[PDB]
Design a protein around this ligand. Structure first.
Ligand code: 014
Ligand code: FE2
Length: 212
């Protein structure tokens, strides 16, 4: 699908009504794997962090991250993922809420190591830091959450219920970054890779430059 069709027939009507959207088979199996390769090559070559400190001798650590600009050697299909997320957002064109989305972060590549850690419930942006849309791309080939866990559970707020989102291969996830969408990753018992880019609201981002 061209970014424009997906954006206007799906992303926008979905985001404005539910505030969470899932695009399956986003880039297709060939490109999907290429990203998998590049992400694994980052892991294998020691670029990831530490890991999130879950339990504070031999402590327990969680998701490792790396920021990727997209032009790095060995990171080109990720760069290309990013450009294609950017195309989607641009073809929304101030149709996402009242938002004027003028920029974004580098890409946070995440590796959950499969040691039963998840990510405690959280709000990507609680204090008004600029971030208004969270875009996540999952690269997990033949993921079974019944066996490996790692489901992402969102608590869209003002709602009795949650939405469980499996970190399926070639899945792309959009959701409002603020207090409307509290979420968590359930414990992952297998390596779980994801890539996140956050989109900035012009105004909120513009005010945050002085406050932080
Ligand atoms: O892979 C996931 O499904 C997932 C869901 N939220 N999450 C998560 N990682 C994050 C990292 C940072 Cl620095 C942050 F500020 C907010 C974050 N939110 C990852
Ligand atoms: Fe998050």
């Amino acid at each position: 699908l061209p970014a424009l069709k997906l954006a206007l027939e799906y992303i926008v009507p979905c985001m404005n009504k539910h505030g969470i959207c899932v695009v399956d088979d986003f880039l297709g199996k060939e490109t999907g794997q290429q990203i998998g390769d590049e992400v694994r090559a980052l892991h294998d070559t020691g670029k990831f962090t530490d890991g999130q400190l879950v339990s504070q001798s031999k402590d327990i650590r969680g998701d490792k991250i790396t920021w990727i600009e997209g032009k790095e050697p060995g990171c080109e299909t990720i760069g290309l993922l990013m450009s294609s997320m950017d195309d989607l957002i641009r073809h929304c064109n101030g149709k996402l809420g009242s938002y004027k989305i003028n920029g974004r972060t580098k890409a946070m590549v995440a590796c959950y190591p499969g040691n039963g850690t998840g990510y405690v419930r959280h709000v990507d942006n609680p204090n008004g830091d600029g971030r208004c849309v969270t875009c996540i791309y999952y690269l997990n080939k033949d993921w079974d959450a019944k066996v490996s866990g790692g489901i992402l559970r969102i608590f869209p707020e003002g709602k009795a219920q949650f939405a469980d989102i499996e970190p399926k291969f070639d899945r792309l996830l959009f959701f409002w970054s603020d207090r409307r969408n509290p979420h968590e990753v359930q414990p992952a018992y297998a390596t779980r890779y994801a890539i996140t880019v956050w989109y900035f609201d012009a105004d909120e981002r513009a005010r945050a430059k002085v406050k932080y």
